[PDB]
């Protein structure tokens, strides 16, 4: 009683395992060295540490189980009932942690540049540690619906085989559709809005200041850091859109099609696209330390001096 197994080309599977292991080692080393560096203004440090922490947790928790339980053993849950519940709870709590961290960092930069007094009053290390603990608690509360919706179900030929058991939303399609579509709706269309518009008006302020920097009498070799700030700004916004759009387009695709439209080709495309979407979310969670590293070439020096 073995069905629902998807017969893919093994060279594509080996080639995405190699990508997954490369993102694994790069994200773990980058996030480990950034937390050690930030651990050795204070609020943006705790914000970057919280986002890097959430990305390290999404890698070390989600990566090896998703690896072993979708790539190698494609059908059985290795981890049991609480394993499914804890996996989707962690995964979605980390997704809300990452999305709300990038929201908070973009609001903090918009605050830090366009409202300096209001950012002075909104920022205190007591308030920032309370705020990050609040945002981790809110990501856990918004991940409680991935606890109660999800579970085990046996979809064998008669529903009684011990290997026909899968890990699936055990609720009907309308409830599934509303829960997953409000997740993708608020968790993505609100961070795309705040990141895009805030970072756009920051980039406007920085490009006017660059055009007022080309004060050449005052200026040392320090117009590189303003262009680098424009580049890191734009790298943040573009990386967040490109990395967290296909994952929710995939979940939308799971959300709307009621199986009357599914074929074998879209079935196979969905499984390969699932692999690619988890590749992109791990590209996000691994390329945060990269594009915080490479722009701050003195903080980068601090990284490589502590590493050497």
């Amino acid at each position: 009683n073995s069905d629902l197994d998807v017969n893919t080309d093994i060279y594509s599977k080996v080639l995405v395992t190699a990508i997954y292991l490369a993102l694994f080692v790069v994200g773990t080393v980058g996030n480990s060295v950034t937390l050690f560096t930030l651990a050795r203004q204070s609020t943006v440090d705790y914000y970057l540490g919280s986002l890097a922490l959430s990305d390290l947790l999404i890698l070390l928790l989600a990566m090896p189980v998703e690896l072993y339980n979708f790539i190698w053993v494609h059908h059985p849950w290795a981890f049991g009932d609480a394993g499914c519940r804890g996996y989707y709870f962690l995964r979605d709590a980390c997704t809300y942690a990452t999305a709300l961290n990038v929201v908070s960092l973009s609001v903090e930069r918009y605050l830090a540049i366009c409202h300096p007094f209001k950012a002075k009053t909104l920022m205190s290390r007591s308030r920032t540690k309370k705020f990050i603990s609040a945002i981790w608690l809110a990501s856990a509360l918004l991940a409680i619906p991935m606890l109660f919706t999800m579970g085990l179900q046996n979809l064998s030929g008669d529903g009684t085989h011990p290997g026909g058991l899968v890990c699936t939303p055990i609720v009907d399609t309308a409830t599934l559709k509303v829960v997953i579509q409000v997740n993708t709706f608020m968790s993505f269309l609100f961070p795309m809005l705040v990141a895009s518009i805030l970072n756009t008006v920051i980039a406007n302020k920085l490009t006017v200041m660059v055009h007022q920097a080309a004060n050449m009498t005052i200026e040392p070799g320090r117009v590189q850091a303003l262009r680098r700030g424009v580049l890191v700004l734009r790298a943040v916004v573009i990386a967040f859109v490109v990395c967290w759009l296909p994952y929710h387009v995939r979940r939308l695709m799971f959300c709307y099609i009621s199986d009357e439209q599914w074929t074998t080709f879209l079935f196979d495309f969905y499984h390969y696209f699932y692999m690619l979407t988890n590749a992109l979310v791990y590209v996000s969670a691994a390329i945060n330390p990269i594009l915080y590293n490479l722009v701050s070439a003195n903080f980068r020096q601090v990284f490589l001096s502590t590493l050497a």
Partner: peptide, 6 residues
Amino acid sequence: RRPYIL
């Protein structure tokens, strides 16, 4: 044929 994958 519905994928259970999510």
